[PDB]
Design a protein around this ligand. Structure first.
Ligand code: PUY
Ligand code: D12
Ligand code: D12
Ligand code: D12
Ligand code: D10
Ligand code: D10
Ligand code: D10
Ligand code: D10
Ligand code: D10
Ligand code: D10
Ligand code: D10
Ligand code: D10
Ligand code: D10
Ligand code: D10
Ligand code: D10
Ligand code: D10
Ligand code: D10
Ligand code: DD9
Ligand code: DD9
Ligand code: DD9
Ligand code: DD9
Ligand code: DD9
Ligand code: DD9
Ligand code: DD9
Lengths: 37, 1033, 156, 150, 50, 50, 50
């Protein structure tokens, strides 16, 4: 099962990467909503 | 209820165990098929009248049968074609839900009573009555590679040695032979016949006499003479068995006493019944088997069993015979299955990773890893118990529900963890407190989701049958999910979660998790500070929301719609159309050139070409064909340029160059019944006995006007064939009577020689097979050959056909259609780009109203369904919408607060529309079911925020803003946890290429885009919604 | 023939007056024939496209072209009751006593379908009224067998 | 639905033993109530059609579609569709030494719809260019044509 | 339901009738059913008002 | 008046070859005899609607 | 018997075969259900085993 090793790795790499993007977006959407006030 | 099972973990574990057993059993007994039954039930009546012409078939068979389809039950419409090859097909289409077995028996029984009204020769061939289906499990080709067998030979071998064994194979429901067993072919020579003053009639008479079964009786049969000893059975004449015996048939004794044997005036050989279709596979003669899956059978097991049975026949094949598998949906279904298990498993691993990331202890992490599979298994148990199958639609229904199932697990567990950190309560009493906060909402959520998704089960017709694969999969998954969340996860939390010290939010941990925790607590302050500012100035955001909604409507109305995405199914067809009157040989040269292109320019991609000369979809005849191309497996065609769509376009472009033939490749529809989303199916009808010429002209009038609104109508065209030259031969009765030549000898001479005649049967190696007479090809090719056939007069003289006949060319129809028993002409077309089919249809109706007196129209097929089941749609959004609101009103005991939830809807839809518009996808059914799971989940998130806020205001007396901020603060984490897991879990589908990627792309991109915007926007806007709604009321 | 003559055969049958016009101005063979020997004039005469019969003849169409069974466009026009086209063809030299392979003449064909006017025209231009077919039958014989008393009177 | 399948299963065993003339008029097996649900009447307000004309129009243009409608057990025409009626005169038949049998034989032979096959039909010779249906006798369509039978 | 479907099918033919033809309705057993049923509906409504 | 083997080859095999794919069929049996008579019997799963 | 000659059991004997093949599975599932029911009534994993 190369595929199961392969799925595991993408998942652990991807949990941080996508997490940052959604947190980045709300922090950033928050700051825009503060300016737009 | 949750409290009951917090103190009864073993009872909850019993339930869970049951459910997994039931689900496990279901996993073993569930049928597996690519698609469920979709098209409404149809029955097809099919007859052959060998050597007949379209009008003769129509006027002596089709009209007779149609006139007797009376008193049959549940009939929506009936259609027919009669064509110039001597074939009629009558199709009766019944209301969805009609029992196909009963429908078929009522049609077959009315036919039976019409049989005495049809020609003897048509009665002798039979009229077949069958369930209409175009869904083959696989097509097995059988070919001969050493040039020692004709396809006539192969077909007989297949029929005699293979078909019956495949028919008996486990799970196969039907087998069609793509050929026919041998027949005894007697090829007549007119010059020899005349030499001996004989005619085809004489040959026919002799064969019927000397190849026949004659009853005799018995020795010592009852009543016996007393004293009789022996009782035996008398065998007299029995059927011939061999060409040698047929050749020895006695035809005449001359005056000198010499004998004329059949073989002296006819060539005799075993051959085919039909010489209409020449099938080749990479240039070699071929036959094949078309195999259909039985009801309730497993496709994967049956295909494997078929291959096993074929395997054990291989040792006995004659030299040069070889099995090939041009068409086999099973490999595709295998990948679909794997992809769906892979998806479910990855989802369970992602929830494990995300639970650990946020909660940082393995005990919490185990709980969804237990709950989710219990719900999945239990859902196959429910599914099976009303006998859905594992099919493509139900399989994607399962992945579209993953978000809802995962969210139920996360919500229950996270809330217990939160309560423990915020209060120091022991796991058991914290779970009790936690479940008290959300059990009401979870039930409310179950009602609301059941009011979004149930309504789509009740559409009608084919698209209704599709929607309800999804509707019942998802509703059962979601109902099992809430049951498990109220009984199993609470018990598990209470017994498996470890206590959390009051105030501990992990900010003082070391390494990564302390960092993560500090960082996330900080991120939560930002967000709430921002929400606080938003809530001090609600006006600007109501305007922003309206902007979003308008942008949603605009985006929506631009996105073109379809039904189901095309796939690289490993095959495509290419169609070959020559002009009128073109011969079999000309078509073969074009098919040969087509096959040569594929095996040469696409050498890497193409495994095989099955070139079938004589069979097309818009009509049959010598002048049409189809080359059916099968590819190497996806694994060896990497890259968008070696996929079907690419090959197709390149192929069609290369063939634009063939002159004197219309030749063009197209992909297969995912489901062959559905035609186009864009398209319509129009029937023009002769309602007052106008006649063929006038109907044709009315058709042409309509087609000319359609062509003048290219803004609205495109590709508006006839489905059928155009009049062609034919040969009018008039028999002069007076001259016939004056010569003493009987009309019956004349007409059977003509028909038997030029059309062929099925005389009777013989027995070839234990199997009954047909006998045919016909002229040798070389004496039935041209008008001058007419005068070479002689008939014997009453006075013994042989009279050439030219003495009593006259002949001229005229034009006539090689395919006559009827619709509900009136002559008809089918017209196809589609809406021009940017136009709805409704608009195109409305114009077609307008144009049709201006046609000649007596000419009417009707809408059929896909357009019948469109008309009736668009009528339905509005009433069902209305019922959905009302019940959603009524459930919310009960949940919150308020007539107004429900609006603060419902407003959340467009927030998910806008990101889904955006994702689809940007990737150039369409509004197809996968996108619209995804559009509904996204709405479901964001509605869920909002229901919990508003429930949390309201409880804070009602129970802890907090102010409007204070409660909203606190509620939104509490739900931030679980909302994020769920979104992270779902967006990641659906990511492989969005980027996926290869087999089934069309569907995977359709469900992934819309869901991921919607989940992004629903997540990011909802958390800012429902606190706005809640605050402005409470303020107004 | 060629690609343009196949286009013309089609345009003549479908009655696309404009296409014919253009193809005339690009030299499409007016004597292109399909498998049974039908020229564009045969087709226009059969399906009744008068303007195209006129156009075709002005471009040198053989007015007395015959199909593989010996039938001319005058046979077709007269049989199917296209009176103008019959007149136009005769005015352009169509052989009025043409016989097809069966000995059938245009007068015969019109008499059988009971086209009285066409029968009169044909006679006017010198149709031989006593023309016999391969069975020795005259237009008169035909009108009595068909019980057409009007036509029987004209032939007398 | 099944009483009818069962009955008809047994009837078809008897069918071949019935007179050809009974068979050709068509036997029906119907499952319907014995009372009329409704009578749809049809008249001509301009008096441009006789009773016989109306019943033919009704029979030929309306009755079949109603009989196929769902829930319609039996449709009884209050009239008769047209047929071609041949009214024999015994005196003229004797004058020409004919009987009704000679007339019937002539009608079958000369009001015929015959399959005659094809030019260049399959299987063909090599190099064939022509494929064309052969059309021979067709069914008659007017009294005039029935009258000129020889 | 069956009477409604018949009427619907008849409606499809009327447009193509030759001049003069006209459908008339001399005998129908269904109208009484619909009408007697609706009178019962009326008494239910009236009863609620009373 | 036919004989078992003529009856088998022309009637019994013809029917049996088309008795495929029927729903819930457990086994099938037939005899063909020298009086020219055939009986083909299909036996269905218990609980099948006869 | 010689190769190519097989056998099958029919009628009442087919049922005999089937009703012994099933029996093991029907004692096993019966016992499991009894055990799981007992665990739920007494809310205990041991009284069931006892
Ligand atoms: C001109 O424009 C169009 C556009 C689309 C179509 C496709 C058609 N719906 C369709 O059914 N297409 C087909 C096939 O692509 C594939 N297939 C597989 N085997 C066969 C088979 N034989 C019996 C010879 N015959 C026909 N189709 C086979 O399954 C489907 C039907 O059984 C045709 C014409
Ligand atoms: C336990 C007290 C809260 C009441 C929640 C009841 C759930 C309402 C569901 C809507 C029913 C139509
Ligand atoms: C499998 C269902 C068995 C029903 C047991 C109900 C009794 C539970 C009460 C525990 C106290
Ligand atoms: C199949 C059920 C597994 C039970 C494991 C429980 C072990 C503890 C038993 C004592 C509880 C009273
Ligand atoms: C009035 C006390 C209610 C007791 C609740 C028990 C419900 C258990 C359902 C399984
Ligand atoms: C599938 C059986 C697993 C049973 C787990 C029960 C754990 C007992 C803790 C109360
Ligand atoms: C008390 C056990 C609840 C049963 C639900 C499992 C699904 C089986 C439905 C047929
Ligand atoms: C025995 C049938 C194979 C079923 C295993 C795959 C289940 C996938 C769930 C949709
Ligand atoms: C189906 C998952 C197996 C159950 C194991 C439960 C672990 C906790 C009990 C001590
Ligand atoms: C076809 C059924 C679609 C129903 C949409 C209703 C949306 C309300 C969501 C709260
Ligand atoms: C018209 C057929 C629709 C059947 C589906 C019924 C839905 C029940 C959902 C609980
Ligand atoms: C095939 C129609 C059957 C409808 C019943 C489904 C009920 C769903 C329960 C989850
Ligand atoms: C489907 C929406 C029903 C509308 C009810 C609104 C309540 C009025 C506000 C108190
Ligand atoms: C059918 C939906 C009815 C909605 C009721 C609204 C009540 C108004 C409360 C003032
Ligand atoms: C034509 C039927 C469409 C059913 C799915 C509804 C789409 C939901 C959009 C809000
Ligand atoms: C064929 C006999 C084998 C029986 C083994 C299983 C017994 C049932 C366990 C409850
Ligand atoms: C073949 C499977 C055997 C299962 C044994 C069941 C014993 C249950 C007692 C708890
Ligand atoms: C005291 C709770 C009773 C639960 C019974 C559930 C099983 C029977 C339907
Ligand atoms: C093996 C199937 C068992 C069904 C529920 C107990
Ligand atoms: C298969 C039918 C299963 C229904 C049983 C419900 C307890
Ligand atoms: C919850 C499942 C009960 C329905 C079982 C009967 C299935 C018949 C199609
Ligand atoms: C086969 C219909 C079963 C319906 C039961 C659903 C609960
Ligand atoms: C067609 C009436 C439907 C009622 C729902 C609102
Ligand atoms: C449906 C009643 C609404 C009035 C407030």
């Amino acid at each position: 099962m190369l595929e199961l090793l392969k799925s595991l790795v993408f998942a652990v790499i991807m949990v941080p990467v996508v997490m940052a993007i959604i947190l980045g977006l709300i922090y950033g959407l928050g700051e825009v909503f503060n300016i737009f006030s | 209820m949750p409290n009951f099972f917090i103190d009864r973990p073993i009872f909850a574990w019993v339930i869970a165990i049951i459910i997994m057993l039931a689900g496990g059993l279901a996993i073993l007994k569930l049928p597996v098929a690519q698609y469920p039954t979709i098209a409404p039930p149809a029955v097809t009546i099919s007859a052959s009248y060998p050597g007949a012409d379209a009008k003769t078939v129509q006027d002596t068979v089709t009209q007779v049968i149609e006139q007797n389809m009376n008193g049959i039950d549940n009939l929506m419409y009936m259609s027919s074609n009669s064509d110039s090859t001597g074939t009629v097909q009558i199709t009766l289409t019944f209301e969805s839900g009609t029992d196909a077995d009963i429908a078929q028996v009522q049609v077959q029984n009315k036919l039976q009573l019409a049989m005495p009204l049809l020609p003897q020769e048509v009665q002798q061939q039979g009229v077949s009555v069958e369930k209409s289906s175009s869904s083959f499990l696989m097509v097995v080709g059988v070919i001969n590679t050493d040039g020692t067998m004709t396809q006539e030979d192969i077909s007989d071998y297949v029929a005699a040695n293979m078909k019956d064994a495949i028919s008996r194979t486990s799970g196969v429901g039907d087998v069609q032979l793509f050929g026919s067993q041998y027949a005894m072919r007697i090829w007549m020579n007119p010059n020899e016949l005349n030499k001996f003053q004989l005619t085809p009639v004489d040959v026919i008479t002799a064969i019927k006499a000397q190849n026949a079964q004659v009853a005799a009786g018995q020795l010592g049969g009852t009543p016996p003479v007393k004293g009789q000893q022996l009782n035996a059975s008398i065998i007299a004449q029995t059927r011939l068995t061999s060409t040698e015996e047929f050749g020895k048939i006695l035809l005449k004794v001359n005056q000198d006493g010499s004998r004329v044997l059949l073989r002296d005036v006819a060539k005799i050989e075993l051959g085919g019944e039909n010489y209409d279709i020449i099938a080749e596979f990479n240039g070699q003669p071929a036959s094949g088997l078309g195999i259909k899956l039985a009801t309730g059978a497993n496709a994967l097991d049956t295909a494997a069993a078929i291959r096993a049975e074929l395997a054990k026949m291989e040792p006995f094949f004659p030299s040069g015979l070889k099995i090939v598998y041009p068409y086999d949906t099973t490999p595709f279904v295998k990948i679909s299955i794997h992809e769906v298990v892979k998806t479910l498993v990855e989802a369970i691993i992602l929830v494990f990773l995300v639970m650990y990331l946020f909660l940082q202890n393995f005990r919490a992490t185990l709980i969804p890893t237990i709950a989710v599979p219990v719900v999945l298994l239990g859902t196959f148990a429910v599914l099976a118990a009303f006998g859905f199958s594992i099919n493509t639609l139900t399989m994607f229904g399962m992945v579209l529900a993953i978000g809802l199932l995962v969210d139920d697990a996360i919500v229950v567990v996270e809330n217990v963890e939160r309560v423990m950190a915020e209060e120091g309560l022991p796991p058991k009493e914290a779970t009790r407190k936690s479940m008290g906060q959300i059990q009401g909402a979870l039930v409310g959520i179950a009602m609301v989701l059941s009011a979004v998704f149930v309504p789509m089960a009740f559409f009608g017709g084919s698209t209704g049958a599709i929607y309800r694969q999804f509707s019942i999969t998802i509703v059962s998954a979601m109902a099992l999910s809430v049951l498990v969340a109220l009984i199993l996860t609470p018990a598990l939390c209470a017994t498996m979660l470890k206590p959390i010290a009051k105030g501990d939010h992990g900010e003082g941990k070391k390494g990564f998790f302390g960092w993560f925790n500090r960082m996330f607590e900080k991120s939560t302050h930002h967000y709430t500070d921002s929400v606080g500012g938003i809530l001090r100035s609600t006006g600007r955001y109501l305007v922003l929301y309206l902007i979003i909604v308008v942008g949603m409507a605009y985006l929506f109305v631009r996105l073109p719609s379809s039904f189901l995405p095309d796939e690289d199914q490993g095959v495509f067809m290419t169609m070959v159309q020559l002009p009128a009157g073109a011969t079999q040989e000309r078509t073969q040269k074009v098919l040969n050139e087509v096959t040569h292109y594929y095996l040469t320019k696409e050498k890497n991609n193409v495994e095989s070409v099955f070139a079938v000369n004589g069979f097309g979809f818009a009509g049959r005849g010598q002048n049409t064909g189809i080359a059916f191309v099968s590819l190497k497996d996806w694994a060896d065609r990497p890259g968008e340029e070696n996929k079907v769509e690419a090959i197709t376009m390149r192929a069609t472009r290369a063939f634009s160059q063939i002159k004197d033939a219309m030749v063009f490749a197209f992909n297969l529809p995912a489901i062959v019944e559905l035609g186009t989303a864009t398209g319509f199916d129009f029937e023009l009808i002769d309602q007052a006995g106008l006649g063929h010429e006038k109907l044709t002209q009315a058709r042409n009038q309509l087609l000319a006007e359609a062509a003048k609104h290219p803004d609205m109508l495109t590709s508006v065209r006839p489905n059928g064939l155009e009049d062609t030259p034919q040969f009018k031969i008039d028999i002069d009765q007076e001259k016939a009577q004056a010569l003493g030549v009987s009309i019956n000898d004349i007409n059977t001479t003509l028909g038997a020689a030029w059309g062929g005649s099925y005389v009777n049967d013989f027995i070839d190696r234990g199997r009954v097979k047909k006998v045919y007479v016909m002229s040798e090809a070389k004496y039935r090719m041209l008008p001058d050959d007419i005068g070479d056939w002689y008939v014997r007069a009453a006075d013994g003289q042989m009279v050439p056909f030219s003495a009593f006949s006259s002949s001229r060319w005229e034009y006539g129809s090689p395919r006559l259609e009827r619709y509900n028993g009136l002559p008809s002409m089918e017209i196809l077309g589609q809406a021009a780009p940017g136009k709805s089919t409704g608009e195109a249809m409305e114009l077609m109706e307008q144009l049709a109203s201006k046609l000649p007196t007596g000419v009417g129209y009707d809408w059929t097929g896909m357009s019948y369904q469109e008309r009736l089941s668009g009528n339905q749609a509005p009433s069902l959004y209305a019922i959905s919408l009302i019940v959603v609101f009524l459930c919310l009103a009960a949940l919150y005991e308020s007539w107004s607060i429900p609006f603060s939830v419902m407003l959340v809807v467009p927030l998910g839809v806008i990101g889904a529309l955006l994702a689809a518009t940007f990737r150039g996808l369409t509004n197809d059914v996968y996108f619209q079911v995804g559009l509904l799971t996204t709405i479901g989940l964001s509605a869920k998130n909002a229901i919990l925020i508003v429930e949390f806020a309201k409880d804070l205001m009602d129970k802890e007396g907090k102010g409007l803003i204070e409660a909203t901020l606190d509620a939104v603060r509490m739900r931030l984490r679980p909302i994020l946890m769920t979104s992270l897991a779902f967006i990641l879990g659906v990511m492989p589908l969005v980027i996926s290429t290869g087999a089934g990627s069309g569907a995977q792309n359709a469900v992934g991109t819309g869901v991921m885009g919607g989940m992004v915007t629903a997540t990011v926007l909802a958390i800012f806007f429902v606190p706005v919604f809640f605050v402005v709604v409470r303020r107004r009321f | 023939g060629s690609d343009l003559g196949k286009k013309l055969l089609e345009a003549a049958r479908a009655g696309r007056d404009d296409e014919v016009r253009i193809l005339m101005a690009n030299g499409a063979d007016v004597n292109a024939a399909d498998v049974v020997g039908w020229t564009p004039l045969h087709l226009a005469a059969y399906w009744g496209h008068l303007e195209i019969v006129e156009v075709l003849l002005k471009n040198g169409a053989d007015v007395n072209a015959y199909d593989t069974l010996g039938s001319t466009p005058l046979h077709l026009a007269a049989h199917f009751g296209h009176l103008e086209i019959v007149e136009v063809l005769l005015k352009n030299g169509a052989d009025v006593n043409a016989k097809d392979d069966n000995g059938i003449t245009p007068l015969h064909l019109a008499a059988n379908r009971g086209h009285l006017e066409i029968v009169e025209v044909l006679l006017k231009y010198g149709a031989d009224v006593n023309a016999q077919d391969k069975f020795g039958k005259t237009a008169f014989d035909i009108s009595i067998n068909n019980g057409n008393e009007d036509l029987a009177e004209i032939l007398q």
